[model samples]
Target: CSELIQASSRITTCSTEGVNTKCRLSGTALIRAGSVGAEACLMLKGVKEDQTKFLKIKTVSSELSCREGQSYWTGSFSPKCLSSRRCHLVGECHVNRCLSWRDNETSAEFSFVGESTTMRENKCFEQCGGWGCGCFNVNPSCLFVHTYLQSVRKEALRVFNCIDWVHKLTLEITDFDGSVSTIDLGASSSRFTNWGSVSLSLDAEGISGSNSFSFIESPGKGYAIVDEPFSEIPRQGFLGEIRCNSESSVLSAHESCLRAPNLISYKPMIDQLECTTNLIDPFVVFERGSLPQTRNDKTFAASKGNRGVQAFSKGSVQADLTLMFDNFEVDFVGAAVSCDAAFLNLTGCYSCNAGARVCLSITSTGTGSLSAHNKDGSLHIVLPSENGTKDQCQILHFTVPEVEEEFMYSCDGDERPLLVKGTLIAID
Candidate 1:
């Protein structure tokens, strides 16, 4: 007979005080997929009188056959004490010590399933006088009942929102058993806000093909393949690209895109999306960016007139300028304005600008200084430095610099619009 998948037994009923200590043991064994007319029997360790020979319990009377997926053989038997003396009788009894099985053609063979030998113990007490005048104290206990097979592996998938806005995401999952399950996350009432993350548990072995995902009221739908083996640490599946000025990054219907608006402006964008297995429950994480709100008082204000006035002496002029670009605002309070004879230059800073931050830097020329020059009778500001200290600021160049009562300058070649407009004031 082929080896049984699993086997278990327990003492169902026992008699402590009687002519002989009697006990009934029940057992069940899981057989393989291709067995015909299989028979199962319980075996116990021999008592003191028959130490050399193992006591074999009664075999199952009904015929058992293997089915398509799983099959089992179940039976129970009572073992009688051979001796009658209180001390000579078996004081202790072990039930379901071993499981023996036989196919239709072969003799019975030992099937080592689950724990080997002596699954449970039973105590036989002698309360009355005479031979075999005792009871067996058998505390009912569960045995090796196998619920789920060893081939199934469970896993958890987590999705995180790092964008400033809320979105409802839906996932359509398909299992190996041809079962489909749908999961909805970040609903309107659920309010999946910024920096929010959620998790879903599923059987890793049951996943058949790639699962589909989509956002509620969104234009696109995408598919994700998550059949890979789980690791000690959670892995990253899809990451959203950092786009500062776009409304939504999901450009195509087939791409699995996340929302990460103005990601370049974030102080620490690296930690925005992370997958770590060091926590109590490991999970695969998907993340994006949470863009900050623009400040209300983000406008440039001059100290005096609309146009820059010529200083009588070599004194410096100051103006308040706040650069606004793609949810980014940098304050330049009382920016220093100096004149080197005919050429005028402007210097300003809040802390330091880089990447998506705001500063007086040029993109084409890669300069850190902004210079004012007279071109075609109108004053035009241009960035002219090669490269200085690499600060936390972005390049700003105005192709059409208008010199009026209230002058306005905007970024020419940049993706996002960087507007710097205010009334120029004259300093006496």
Candidate 2:
């Protein structure tokens, strides 16, 4: 005799965005003969927008025959969660831009096939803020909820790391016959890649059962040639590299790379965070995620020497660069500068090393020169040449990279054969 045991339970509403709403039942066992099937999602209020479905289910069948019919349905499966969980996906929206640039080909012109993956965390609706661990969407407005990065604190049980796996969804079950249960869509367990098969279960009638799931990382790991054992002031060949003073100054460049706010991907974030470090380059290291901390010091220094270029930032707003020429000296100040393809602007001022204050500016045509007068409104001082004082004059021309607004100064060495070609970065 196959006696059927009909049981059910209910879950109130808990909203993420407080918009798209619906009621739900988590645990309801549909018994027929010896077969037992679980009712995972019972949307009390039918949904209008078919795209915003919270409760989902599907099934596949196998038999002794050569061919067997397979079936798929929503909220009506023998079990709750996916048994062959292939990276359980929650939010189906696409990322803005920065992340798309990380490893995907959507940003750069490189030929390498991208190896990074991104998942959007869109809103999910909830039913009630009850004692149990589940939600049921009701009102459309009540169904709306924004998504965020997967965190490490709350699982219906113990604790799980987010790097290892991202969460899918929570289920609550109920029946008119006085049976209730809660379900958790376990974590996606994969190591090198993302997604894995998972299990499904209702809280034991005692509600003491724990969620057993494995954790894994999201960021794709790869190897790169690195510069080892960095020195205080790096003195590498600056021909094939971008050099900057302090780490803080380099960090400030994030604003130039962030692309846009409501972006399409995260390519800049990857360039800013992961792919920038290299064996040949070791100067500018843009800090990921935020702006550079506020600092008002004047201790930064660097130079484009004959052998190569040397620079270091000790956390300062001013660029204290001194170029030692064969006949004269050049001093640049108020290093906070910004740039574009046809224009370059320096907010502060520049001074020849001879106590003569001068400022620099460039035209849209890419031609530039120094302006006379010191900060104290004094006349420029003549160069005090000590070595081979045959000539003591410097004319300056500057250029800003079309794409990256890095600062560049070019002094065509006709008079003073010692050229001054150095790069500068500013805060503003």
Candidate 3:
């Protein structure tokens, strides 16, 4: 005798969202039959908010002709719901008249309930034509049904550095599932008056649960580490502050010194002064030792033991001394003082050859001016007397291009042959 052996069903597609729900499901039935008289039908059953009651929604019939020997039948159906009510759905297939007029059925179920969905499948088999006749075995692939509902919202987290010093900031975000993400904000360049900001995209649903955030700061690449906590986060996204509360004098000192003309070369020295604060306050206070100092001989020095006003001393001494030592100076007899062109600026003090009618010549791709000034800050190119006195040093000022450009300046007269060549780079 021939009989139905196995039957199964599956859902090909389903609507995941929206008020209306639609699904396309198919079923298959395998039977042991000799003739082609077997027939199959696929059906959809659903319950609207009630578990005990179910109604037949739709049905589809298989092909009219079935194959002989291990016959297979398949059918499909599309079920749709116009209402937004919660519902449970099942796809079932039944086959009968398999030569011996025996029948069997199988089913799979899915549900839509308030933004959540669940699915389950059922399998069945009957043993025959051997030692185990009429023995039925039922195996369900999905043993339990589960549904999860969550509301998601997008929010932003903004981090700001309110201190004067530049720092490399890093942010760590921990999600609800124990996964961590890191964001590195390279450097904060807003200096003192304004705040520098960096933003992060976050999910409010994650933060409202077990999500967390932490921050770290480094003054530079090879600097000290500072860790701080992110106490609270707002729903509409708010600014997170990184503050310094100890004292503003040191920061102000560095700001003033760094703002001076051509002090960019001394940045490495200024960066060595450490600033630290406790975790509770989240403030940074500068260390007060070995600050930048000015020497009595009108020279600037940044060493371990010297101390001053945390920056340049009074009377704009460092500025005036920088003008004296950090520029190109040539004596009357063609001898250059501090001949290293790498350490010179466009302005300096130089002496012309006595009684030689010296002329300063400058060659560049762009326009420039070569003017002379008195030591008393007057505007005049004064020449030395016939006796060539030592007090005849005149301050010469050369204009540099705003962009990076190469220029050469020479004091060419009476064969003195003084040349200083370099490129001038403008500081941003």
Candidate 4:
């Protein structure tokens, strides 16, 4: 004759964008098991849009004939606080500097094929947040059969680190009832090259527990590279060779380079922190999460567009064309200049420097020499002579580059060459 002990708990609802909360048990456990195969009942709760679920237990039987079977259903494995344990991930940094560039690919689409054996700290979430840690659809904290929303934090504990092991992860999902299912999935870098595995280990007591599985990075350990020292790879380069500047800028002439710069695969080598004398480690150094002490209405930078004259924001380019080059040397019409690269005697060419070939070739639709001027109201070429004497001149043929606009014939060069100052203008 045997007896079964049933236990349960409860959690409340709390909502804020990224606030830390807990998953307390609803009530106590309902015990009614008198036999070995007896059943138990449980209760749960959570926020409105928030939901709940359970992880099932499975038993693999090993006999003369190999076969795996589901034996029993275990309820909640443990109570969860779900509060953030922010800390530095404790482990060696990743050093894969040889992974090839995957054109037009996102981080979610990397090639990972190993057990990413690693350790993590509070900053662990920075890694989990790599793809869908912000989401539950992919890695559901609970299987959502007979659960509540408050338990989301508890379910979130199973959040796996994708780069800790070198083998494919087999997740066994359980529900409130007595049922279990297996979910086969690969971790980080599983989509790109086979950097090795993810053995990411984590102690949830710290805030970085979200990425605990990525700590052990020893020589030949072969962990997938994601970040290093205190930086993250550009979703393309491996960790070992990553640079500190990758955070703000991509190495593209036009923000759309198809090929990544010298990305190489490497075994992680350096680990550095706080000390500037140490070799720059490309591995990541996680930071603790905190709310801003200073609040502002300002949001993120809405996408700007150099692609055209228009962007998501409302603004304009200075387009004034001051023509103060008639009354005097600096005198050109409708431009911003007391004087712009002006010369008393404008010369089409430099002092035979040949280097300064201020060549002026113009074809004006205007009828008179005095009226026709360059769009920039600038002297296309300084027809000035090498001597100290000044030359008074009128509009002559001027030329310019085949750019957005051209600077051609202008008034005599008395002042320094007119600089490119800008104001507002109506192009209509």
lDDT of 4: 0.22
Task: Report the number of backbone clashes for model 1.
Answer: 20
The candidate, 1 or 2, that scores higher on TM-score is 2
| TM-score of each candidate structure, all chains considered together | 0.11, 0.12, 0.13, 0.13
List lDDT for all candidates, in order.
0.22, 0.21, 0.21, 0.22
Off by over 4 Å in 2: 1-164, 179-183, 188-249, 252-428
State the lDDT at 214 in candidate 1: 12
Model 2 TM-score is: 0.12
Question: Which runs of model 4 end up more than 4 angstroms from their true locations?
Answer: 1-180, 183-428
- Residue 319, candidate 1: C-alpha displacement in angstroms: 26
What lDDT does model 3 reach? Answer: 0.21
State how far residue 191 of model 3 sits from its true place (Å). 15
Model 1 TM-score relative to the real fold: 0.11
Q: What is candidate 4's lDDT per residue for 1-428, written digit by digit as tens?
A: 12223222222223322111234332212222221122222222333223433322221110011011111100111111111211122121122211221222222112232222111011111222112344322221110011001111121100002222122223232334335454332222111111111121211111122232221121222112122221122333322222221212211111221222323221211111111111212222111101111112111111133210101101111111111111110011121112212323233422222222222222222211211234555534333221122323433332332212234334332232222222222222
